[PDB]
A paper describes a structure:
We determined the crystal structure of the TRFH (TRF homology) domain of TRF1 in complex with a short TRF1-binding motif of PinX1 and revealed that PinX1 bound to TRF1 via the F-X-L-X-P motif, providing a structural basis of how PinX1 is recruited to the telomeric region by TRF1. We demonstrated that PinX1 is directly associated with and inhibits telomerase activity by TID (telomerase inhibitory domain) with crucial lysine residues clustered in PinX1292-301.
We have reported the crystal structure of the telomeric TIN2-TRF1 complex previously, revealing that the short TBM (TRFH-binding motif) of TIN2 directly binds to the TRFH of TRF1.2 Notably, an 11-residue fragment of PinX1 (R287-D-F-T-L-K-P-K-K-R-R297), referred to as PinX1TBM, closely resembles TIN2TBM, indicating that it may bind to TRF1TRFH in the same fashion as TIN2TBM does. To provide direct and independent evidence of the PinX1-TRF1 interaction, we purified a high-quality TRF1TRFH-PinX1TBM complex and determined its crystal structure at a resolution of 2.7 Å. The structure showed that TRF1TRFH formed homodimers, with each TRF1TRFH interacting with one PinX1TBM peptide. The electron density map demonstrates that the PinX1TBM peptide assumes a well-defined conformation. Similar to the TIN2TBM-TRF1TRFH interface, hydrophobic contacts are essential for the interaction between PinX1TBM and TRF1TRFH. L291 of PinX1 was deeply buried in a pocket formed by L86, R102, C126, and T130 of TRF1, supporting previous findings that the L291E mutation in PinX1 disrupts its ability to be bound and recruited by TRF1.2,3 The aromatic side-chain of F289 of PinX1 packed against a hydrophobic surface of TRF1 and the proline ring of PinX1 P293 stacked with TRF1 F142. Notably, except for R297 of PinX1 that is engaged in electrostatic interactions with E146 and E192 of TRF1, all other basic residues in PinX1TBM (K292, K294, K295, R296, and K299) extended outward from the interface and did not contribute to the interaction with TRF1. As a natural suppressor of telomerase, PinX1 represents a potential strategy for curtailing cancer progression by targeting telomerase. This study reported the crystal structure of the TRF1TRFH-PinX1TBM complex and confirmed that PinX1 was recruited to the telomere by TRF1 predominantly via the binding to the F-X-L-X-P motif, highlighting its tumor-suppressive impact on CESC.
Numbering used by the authors:
A (entry chain F): 287 to 297
B (entry chain B), C (entry chain A): 62 to 267
D (entry chain E): 285 to 297
Write the structure that this text describes.
């Protein structure tokens, strides 16, 4: 849905 | 018609797969199997993304899966888990920990306070002292912060002492053991779900 | 040991999820539900990537999922499905069609020839007359000359006839409906698989 | 194994 488990590589 | 009953049948199977992949994620997290955790995470991502609506039971399951993915990447500071670019991995799990509809018991407070400490300690195991101060202000200026260590943490930041013995007592290892204790509690709550209990009976007699 | 019986149970449930995600992918492909096809494809690819070892029956299921993805992107020429950058999607779907363990009957031969014809027709309706000539040789060229209209296609490429009537009789849609005719066969062949079966029973009583 | 099979393509072939 609008839920995320994987991150992106620049915070 | 058939198309409507198919959509309902695919929703029941999707809920079964979420409970199973949640149990597999907690088990790989507890055992420390990183590669199996990475693959089970990707499977849980797409299964959750395919769900149209969500029940209150499935919402808690997603939060639990979210909580483990960010604790597993707690020391990786540049890993952005939220659309909000300022949320570090540990303070993202801190928001999820308060979002899970669960018992706010003794173990809940210990995990919460250890996450708040390590959210700053992780920023200071590197040379990111500016990020540590900005994490402290986001978690603790006023007034939702009844932690007595608010004074000691604010002082440790301006010490530049990375190997501070305060962080060796409230360490990442102690935070992991408290979370893995809760993971074991979740691991036994849904160990009797449909998909896992069915697959277990196939292997048990085999 | 309890850990070994768990890994086998997860590998069993992973096979149940792969079969179900194949039904959902086949049904979304036939029904033309583009967004449900995109989500089911992501769920299938993550479960496939999570499999440690494959059986002959599971490899057949993966190739069915792969075949539907290249066919769905047959007209998307800038899509790269293989490491070789010169393989068009319809060329990639042709290689998978010859790898699925299945009957090589009249329907299989009709679909294969329609893929070969449309692999060139897709390049024709984009101005890529050079790539259409390269696709023609990788498929036909003079390997063993086992095709009648092999010489008729060569001239149409030299015609630079972007929209030829020959491509409209052996059309992209005639290739589609014959694939969906086979998809309906796979939909019936696997309709009794465990996960979709128990999910259907739950909906029937409700 | 399962990691060798891709369902998604790449942009700009």
């Amino acid at each position: 849905r609008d839920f995320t488990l994987k991150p992106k590589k620049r915070r | 018609e058939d198309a409507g009953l198919v959509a309902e049948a695919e929703a029941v199977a999707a809920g079964w797969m979420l409970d199973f992949l949640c149990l597999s994620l907690c088990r790989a997290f507890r055992d420390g199997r990183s590669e199996d955790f990475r693959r089970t995470r990707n499977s849980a991502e797409a299964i959750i993304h395919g769900l149209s609506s969500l029940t209150a039971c499935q919402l808690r399951t997603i939060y639990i899966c979210q909580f483990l993915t960010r604790i597993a990447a707690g020391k990786t500071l540049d890993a952005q888990f939220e659309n909000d670019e300022r949320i570090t991995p540990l303070e993202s799990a801190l928001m999820i920990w308060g979002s899970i509809e669960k018992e706010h018991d003794k173990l809940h407070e210990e995990i919460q306070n250890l996450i708040k400490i390590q959210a700053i300690a992780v920023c200071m195991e590197n040379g990111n002292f500016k990020e540590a101060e900005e994490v402290f202000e986001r978690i603790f200026g006023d007034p939702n912060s009844h932690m007595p260590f608010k004074s000691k943490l604010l002082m440790i930041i301006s010490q530049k002492d990375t190997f501070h013995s305060f962080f060796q007592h409230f360490s990442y290892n102690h935070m992991m053991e408290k979370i893995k204790s809760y993971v074991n509690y979740v691991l036994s709550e849904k160990s009797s779900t449909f998909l896992m209990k069915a697959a277990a009976k196939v292997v048990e007699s085999k």
